[PDB]
Design a protein around this ligand. Structure first.
Ligand SMILES: CSc1ncncc1CC(=O)N1CCC[C@H](C(N)=O)C1
Ligand SMILES: [Zn+2]
Length: 139
């Protein structure tokens, strides 16, 4: 679990969005596993606007942060799960690192701010949904 809180927006994994997220929907994209909802309180986070390919992510299944080298955002095949059919997920970045079900929502940060959130994983890989192209989160 986990979310990004920026300005009057909350960014979550679309597959983990609550009834309240859907009732306050701003934008969602099943191909990216992202959903953004509106909030009344001002957020705590800032978003990176960069091309970093290294950073640090929070891994809730280890209660620890780990450094990662990750690929540029791209279209990646993701196997069927209870949440989605087998499909290509867009704007996804892969890295070698631990992840297990329950870790989605962990934040990836570089020196510039928030890069994205954990969205996929398996067998020593971890995949992050990029948010750096969503320029409207800042205004
Ligand atoms: C950190 S998630 C994880 N980690 C390790 N092993 C399995 C997983 C589970 C996983 O990859 N998915 C299930 C939930 C929907 C995800 C999606 N974005 O389509 C795909
Ligand atoms: Zn950066």
């Amino acid at each position: 679990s986990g979310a990004i809180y920026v300005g009057n927006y909350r960014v979550v994994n679309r597959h983990l969005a609550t009834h309240n997220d859907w009732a306050n929907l701003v934008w969602e994209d099943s191909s990216r596993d992202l959903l953004v909802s509106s909030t009344t309180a001002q957020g705590c986070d800032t978003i990176a606007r960069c091309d970093c390919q290294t950073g640090v992510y929070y891994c809730s299944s280890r209660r620890k942060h780990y450094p990662v080298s990750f690929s540029k955002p791209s279209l990646i095949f993701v196997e069927a799960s209870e949440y989605y059919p087998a499909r290509y997920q867009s704007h996804l970045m892969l890295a070698v690192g631990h992840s297990e079900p329950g870790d989605c929502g962990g934040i990836l940060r570089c020196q510039h701010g928030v890069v994205g959130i954990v969205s996929t994983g398996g067998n020593g890989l971890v995949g992050f949904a990029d948010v750096r192209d969503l320029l409207w989160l800042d205004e």
